[PDB]
Design a protein around this nucleic acid. Structure first.
Lengths: 158, 217, 104, 290, 75, 121
RNA sequence: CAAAUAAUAACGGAGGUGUCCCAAGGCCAGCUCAGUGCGGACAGAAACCACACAUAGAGCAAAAGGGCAAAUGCUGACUUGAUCUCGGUGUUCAGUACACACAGGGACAGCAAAAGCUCGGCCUAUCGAUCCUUUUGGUUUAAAGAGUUUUUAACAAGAGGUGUCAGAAAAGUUACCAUAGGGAUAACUGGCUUGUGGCGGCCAAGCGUUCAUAGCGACGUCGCUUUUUGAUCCUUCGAUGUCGGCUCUUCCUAUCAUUGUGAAGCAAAAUUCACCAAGCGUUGGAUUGUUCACCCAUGCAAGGGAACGUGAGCUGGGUUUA
RNA sequence: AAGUAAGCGCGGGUCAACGGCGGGAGUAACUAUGACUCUCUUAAGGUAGCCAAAUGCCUCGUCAUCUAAUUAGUGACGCGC
RNA sequence: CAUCUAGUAGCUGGUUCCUUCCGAAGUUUCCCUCAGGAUAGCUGGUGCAUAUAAAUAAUCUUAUCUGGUAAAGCGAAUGAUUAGAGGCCUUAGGGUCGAAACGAUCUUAACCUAUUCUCAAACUUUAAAUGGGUAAGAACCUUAACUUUCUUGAUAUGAAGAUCAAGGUUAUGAUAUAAAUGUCCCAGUGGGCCACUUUUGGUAAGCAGAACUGGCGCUGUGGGAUGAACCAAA
RNA sequence: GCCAACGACCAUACCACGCUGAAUACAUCGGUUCUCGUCCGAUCACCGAAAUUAAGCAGCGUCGCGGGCGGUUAGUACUUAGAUGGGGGACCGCUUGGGAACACCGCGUGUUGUUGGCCU
């Protein structure tokens, strides 16, 4: 009967990776964080100041604040069963940029590049994503060394 | 009090070791794992024969101790004194405990009736798996028939069921007998006691001419 | 033997600036009559009720937090701040020595 | 040591493996706030050598520092100083050369002239009104030992004489003693104009006159005498204040394919034929056994 | 007599009924616990917008009277 | 130790070091005391070598019973130019194989300078 | 433990806390630690000096864990940011408190040439409401007829303490006992369970003059048996009379004897092993309340148990009210 | 702030007041045993007696007696829970 | 004996008409609290804001981040552990042919190096499945040049904000039991129990304790002869 | 083809050796009056010029170690979901999807940004 307290169970959460110990690379402090930016939390065990508490590791929020060393990130925690949006002041070394939306934003960049040159053709602009449709009718040619090439089900004996 | 493994037959739990965290673990009265001519070379004993578990049992230390002596005493009686190497490949680092209830004098009431349960380590056992060997005897091919009966006599002192496999290997090395004979026929099997050394292309080159200075000279 | 200096250079909020202060202790300055909650205590137990009020046995702590008075040298202005709990405490008294011989 | 701490071996970065960077100072020199979002900070980097003084202005960007102004000591022959390129005196030129090199291209030489009245006092430029102040640098010394009177502090007073706003204290200027401070501008003024290099070569024709052919050689070759240095450096402090034009050269265009020397490394077909004859002629040499 | 404490049984049936409830999406989220010197006369970066188009596209040529600030902003 | 009587920080020894052309006073002044012919090891693999003499008044020192006689410890570290490559704080490095001088080039330096014999014991 | 987010139980397992610290806090600079190798008089397994290797194998008041190498380690330098203030957030959470951490704003200061962001201890523990008392504090507000000084009060911030730690002020005994309830809870029956005992079957080291199994039978191994005996708490506390003996009936077979047999290391006699087999039988006493075991004796021969069998069947010796 | 009454504290008496009344070694010609010695202590170390007792756990003590046979009885014995 | 007195009871018992509709809880924290509260959750009632898209909200696909469990591993570290093999050696435990011999075999055990058997609740280079989070558009995407003391820069180009400009086809799939929001903080509840799977203690248990989802409680009916829970179906 | 200062990613860059090296450089190097620091001008600080096969980033070489990427292990291990499937149990088959790891073999052995120069 514990969780309680504050870095418990984080023997593997705030560990370092293997041979990624030591000095922090310098671009970690050279990243720019503007208000309203999507941001993951993966805490740094080698920076003992401004670590998020363990519920928020692995999560994802939006930057609501910038101060001199940290960003306020607003993160969702399910406190059962309901979702509060938690405001967590977290230092910059524990904070990353989300890649999730900058491969949505390279489609807004193409839902206006492809609708641009569609002023000549007209249609279909085809600006929606399609799931993996079932395949087609297609003519598999053999030739290729005609078949059989015939498996039979056999591997036991030892 | 050395109660047997007769009623142990649901075994559940992650292996508690004899480590720096349950210190008080005893000296084992079951120590030796291997016997026969254990100083024999690779070339002496081509035949390997295993006793292989086709269940998921929990083989005891006293079962494994008993089965080695019955495999020993038949082989030193029939196939020669030192024409074998028995390797007992199940080293039992397990802790089976016992809640002992010191209930002498019938009146004390203090220690444990069902509250509370710390244990005391008495057992030591080996998990086997399917297809996983239990002991391998290495001997010549003249005593192939004498080998299997000593493993048969060891079967009836283990729980579960077990299958006696003549392995098609050449000894305890992980080679086919043909692939042992071909690879030893040029240079590449540089021998040791139990095992050979393998197929070296690296590194760097100094132990290539040392082979070539000892294939010709 | 937790060691504290007799003099501290710290903020005084009457000169609004760091001055030099002199550190002291506090103990208690015992209770008057009449305090209010003592004049009221003394009329409950005017006689024939018989112990109208709790009596605190079952105490638990060994230590106390030390109230370090810090009087200012210029304005003569005393602040206080508590330190943590510790068993022995001394004002001034022999800064520890760095790397000398271990005396038996 | 044998294959198994090599597996667990974590190198240091690349430059701390090679002595170049602190990374405990590089972390703290290149610190910008996060509510100062992408503003550069432009530190002042004077690195010494044996026969060069590299002064630079670089700002912290991710794919490398970007160098915005770079004045060296191997160009001060163009401004009237031929030898003694790594002086305490010859740094204040490359200090002053890198400040006037950058305020003309930023247009901040009409305002923020500087200190041509070179005295050695503490000089902190008050901001020219109608707007904020001037270009700020911060001095980045590396792990030069910052004891008082080093040449690395001989480019901070040079650059602050051009007019740049680099934060100060005179504690490490040559001629400010340690009991107390005791400001003294004159030993700083002596060192600025190269007086104590002149005084040593005015004190060496009294003790050991043969040692001119030792230390302070090549003054004998180029004819620089000791009384000239207070006016060699003085007339250089306006010839530098009059032509800071970056020394850009145009070969046009000889950098790539020069011309003959690509230096290929043993294509793996050759390495497997290198150890074709290395193996075949060894056993033929072992056929000279029989 | 000491019966049965601690279970998360029924606790997600019972928490999925009135459902598991995202907060709600606002166009105006609060500025509180935010950097106060970022906010305190950016209050007056709003209050300096007395006009925004009439007197303001006058400014595009009022500073192009001095040809803008095209060069010297490049430090 | 409790066997010699020393503890933490009990100030047992006194040493100094002499570098460069003033050692060649105190080297050869204490080497003819050892009558320059010196033992064989006595010669480290790191290229330094050294010896020890008792009777400290053979260094041109008068006996002077106000101080007493003493036995000393002479260690001669030895090296080529470029050995400050690992000693600078900025942009350091290591010396390599050649240069780095063996035992048998300190002995080679000793059969020539002071003309000693290596005394195979 | 815990089942790859977080959460998560048992009187689960392994430990730790109630402190220590003027440096062991703050910060700059210099420095490299465990160990290892070759050396250097006394000097050895270790004293010290010095070189070369050393991925942290050291050290950091840290219990364990994470972390850390021109440091957070070691040494020096000055130092008091272990300061004043005002909110906000994280944890625990009811999204309350304290408390602990954090990220800021406003000062004022330390170190540093400077960048640097120092709001105690590298991080995760090291602690505490109301009322009361008591300091510091405004250079104060009130005592209600009005001034003056003392006194008291009030307000801000600390301290004094609640270790059952969200915080009564608290020793037994009852077999003389009472009440409300409880099968949410013991004592006996019934149920499940069997570690303990025993009864079987495999393998055969061996014992048996010789002979592995006439008769045995080690080390192992797989089952059956709850009744003793624990474990359990399901049914019963508006009550199921709680040990034995006496009486009397029925049932089992795990067979003592007898019938019918097979086997012996079976000559006869006597015995031993096993098979079909529950029909008839399995007694009289001394001592003890016993229940088993023991004793005298008879007996061809003196087996083991079931309805905890059996108190409106008795008895009342055990146990057990005054 | 002095001086202050009883009571307490300090001092003495008292056990047919309430109550209590110890260990560990070494030694005598076969063994055995310990009159004897040393020592640790205590307010005093359980004396005269008595006893497996209506009082002894071990235990149905051991010996004798009583009986054909006695976990009972009686007589003894005694480091006596 | 009479009164105070209908003393008090977190405890037992009982609590009186029909149909219709909706439908629980045995968990959280805290309490001299453990047969009880208060608290939050779960419930109902009563509304109200929006009816002749591009409003959104919930299981999959896509994009991205997270994770150290299964497996894997010990010829990687830390802990174990089994056997030999090749040897530095000068550690010898002394040897052996010899007074010790170095004149030779080396004998063995140390130590070193290439291998080896077998493994870890409080080990791990690697590392799934099932999971956790986020995103998938007018609340948008590119502009233009204005405001700012706080804001930064020597920039009244930053960074936030306030405006005009220009943008085919609202930017996976499937759904919409109507969803949103308040109030009575509204009643009951706060003994649970069973099962697959994973689990801890225990020799075991129709035993003790947990995670997950589904069930009985609260529920008839079909099947399993029989039966709380199983199979089917409400 | 390179050289330097400042870097980013932080071993494809490291480690062990070996062998080259034009030119700018970078060094080692010389000295201690000055500023500065040591027990010591070795280190640090400062003045600044008399010889090169050590640093240095390399040019590299190595059937190199490590590290890196691919292949193969392997549709293997495990695992989602299913059954009135099996078996005395332990556990195992199949259905429905998802899908590792050691090793093993092969491959390559820093990539680049800004600013100043050199040209074998």
């Amino acid at each position: 009967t514990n969780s309680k307290g504050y870095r418990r169970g984080t023997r593997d959460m705030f560990s370092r990776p293997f041979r990624k110990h030591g000095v922090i690379p310098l671009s970690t402090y050279m990243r720019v964080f503007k208000i309203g930016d999507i941001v993951d939390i993966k805490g740094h065990g080698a920076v003992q100041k401004g670590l998020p508490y363990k519920a928020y590791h692995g999560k994802t929020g939006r930057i609501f604040n910038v101060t001199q060393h940290a960003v306020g990130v607003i993160v969702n925690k399910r406190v059962r069963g309901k979702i509060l949006a938690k405001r967590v002041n977290v230092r910059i070394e524990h904070i990353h940029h989300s890649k999730c939306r900058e491969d949505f934003l390279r489609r807004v960049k193409e839902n206006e590049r492809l609708l641009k040159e569609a002023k000549e053709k007209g249609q279909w602009v085809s600006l929606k994503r399609q799931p993996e449709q079932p395949k087609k009718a297609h003519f598999v040619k053999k030739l290729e060394e005609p078949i059989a090439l015939a498996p039979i089900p056999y591997e036991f004996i030892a | 009090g050395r109660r047997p493994a007769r009623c142990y037959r649901y075994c559940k739990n992650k292996p508690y070791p004899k480590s720096r965290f349950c210190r008080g673990v005893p000296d084992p009265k079951i120590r030796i794992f291997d016997l026969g001519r254990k100083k024999a070379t690779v070339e002496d004993f081509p035949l390997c024969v295993h006793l292989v578990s086709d269940e998921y049992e929990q083989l005891s230390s006293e079962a494994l101790e008993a089965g080695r002596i019955c495999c020993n005493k038949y082989l030193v009686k029939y196939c020669g004194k030192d024409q074998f190497h028995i390797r007992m490949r199940l080293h039992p680092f397990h802790v089976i405990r016992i809640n002992k209830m010191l209930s002498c004098a019938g009146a004390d009431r203090l220690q444990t009736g069902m509250r509370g349960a710390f244990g005391k380590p008495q057992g030591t056992v080996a998990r086997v798996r399917i297809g996983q060997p239990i002991m391998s005897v290495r001997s010549s091919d003249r005593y192939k028939a004498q080998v299997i009966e000593a493993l048969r006599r060891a079967k009836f002192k283990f729980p579960g069921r077990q299958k006696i496999y003549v392995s098609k290997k050449w000894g305890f090395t992980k080679y086919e007998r043909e692939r042992y004979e071909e690879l030893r026929d040029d240079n590449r099997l540089e021998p040791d006691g139990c095992n050979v050394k393998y197929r070296p292309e690296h590194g760097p080159i100094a132990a290539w001419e040392k082979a070539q200075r000892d294939v010709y000279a | 033997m937790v060691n504290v200096p007799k003099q501290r250079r710290t903020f005084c909020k009457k000169c609004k600036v760091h001055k030099l202060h002199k550190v002291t202790q506090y103990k208690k300055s015992k209770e008057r009559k009449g305090a209010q909650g003592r004049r009221r205590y003394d009329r409950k137990q005017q006689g024939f009720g018989g112990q109208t009020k709790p009596i605190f046995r079952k105490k638990a702590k060994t230590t106390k937090k030390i109230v370090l008075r810090m009087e200012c040298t210029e304005c003569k202005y005393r602040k206080q701040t508590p330190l943590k709990r510790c068993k022995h405490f001394e004002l001034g008294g022999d800064k520890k020595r760095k790397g000398q011989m271990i005396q038996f | 040591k044998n294959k198994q701490y090599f597996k667990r071996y974590q190198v240091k970065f690349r430059r701390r493996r090679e002595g170049k960077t602190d990374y405990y100072a590089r972390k703290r020199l290149t610190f910008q706030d996060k509510n100062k979002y992408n503003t550069p900070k432009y530190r002042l980097i004077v690195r010494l050598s044996n026969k060069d003084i590299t002064v630079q202005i670089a700002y912290a960007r991710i794919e490398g520092d970007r160098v915005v102004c770079a004045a060296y000591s191997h160009e001060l022959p163009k401004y009237g100083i031929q030898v003694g390129l790594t002086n305490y005196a010859a740094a204040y030129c490359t200090g002053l050369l890198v400040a006037r090199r950058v305020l003309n291209k930023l247009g901040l030489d009409s305002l923020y002239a500087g200190c041509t009245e070179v005295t050695g006092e503490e000089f902190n430029v008050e901001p020219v009104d109608d707007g904020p102040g001037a270009f700020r640098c911060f001095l980045d010394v590396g792990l030069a030992r910052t004891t008082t009177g080093a040449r690395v502090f001989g480019a901070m007073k040079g650059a602050v004489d051009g007019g740049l706003n680099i934060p100060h204290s005179v504690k490490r200027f040559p001629g400010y003693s340690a009991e107390t401070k005791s400001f003294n501008a004159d030993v700083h003024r002596a060192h600025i104009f190269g007086q104590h290099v002149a005084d040593y070569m005015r004190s060496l024709e009294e003790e050991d006159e043969e040692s001119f052919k030792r230390q302070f050689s090549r003054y004998i070759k180029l004819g620089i005498r000791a009384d000239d240095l207070e006016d060699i450096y003085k007339k250089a402090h306006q010839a530098i204040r009059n032509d800071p034009t970056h020394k850009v050269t145009a070969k046009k265009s000889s950098a790539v394919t020069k011309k003959r020397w690509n230096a290929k490394k043993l294509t793996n077909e050759q390495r497997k034929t290198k150890i074709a004859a290395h193996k075949a002629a060894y056993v033929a040499k072992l056929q000279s056994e029989t | 007599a000491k019966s049965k404490n601690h279970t998360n049984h029924n606790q997600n049936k019972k928490a999925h009924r009135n459902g598991i409830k995202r907060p709600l999406r606002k166009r105006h989220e609060s500025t509180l616990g935010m950097d106060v010197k970022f906010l305190i006369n950016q209050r007056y970066a709003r209050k300096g917008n007395l006009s925004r188009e009439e007197s303001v596209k006058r400014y595009n040529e009022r500073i192009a009277s001095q040809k803008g600030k095209p060069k010297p902003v490049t430090l | 130790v409790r066997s010699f009587g020393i503890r933490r920080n009990e100030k047992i020894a006194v040493h100094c070091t002499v570098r460069g052309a003033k050692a060649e006073e105190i080297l050869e002044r204490g080497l003819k005391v050892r009558e320059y012919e010196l033992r064989r090891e006595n010669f480290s693999s790191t290229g330094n070598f050294g010896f020890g003499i008792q009777e400290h008044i053979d260094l041109g020192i008068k006996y002077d019973p106000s101080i007493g006689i003493y036995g000393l410890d002479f260690y001669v570290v030895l090296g080529r130019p470029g050995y400050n490559v690992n000693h600078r704080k900025r942009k350091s490095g290591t010396v390599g194989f050649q240069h780095r001088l063996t035992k048998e080039d300190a002995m080679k330096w000793f059969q020539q300078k002071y003309d000693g014999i290596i005394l195979n014991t």
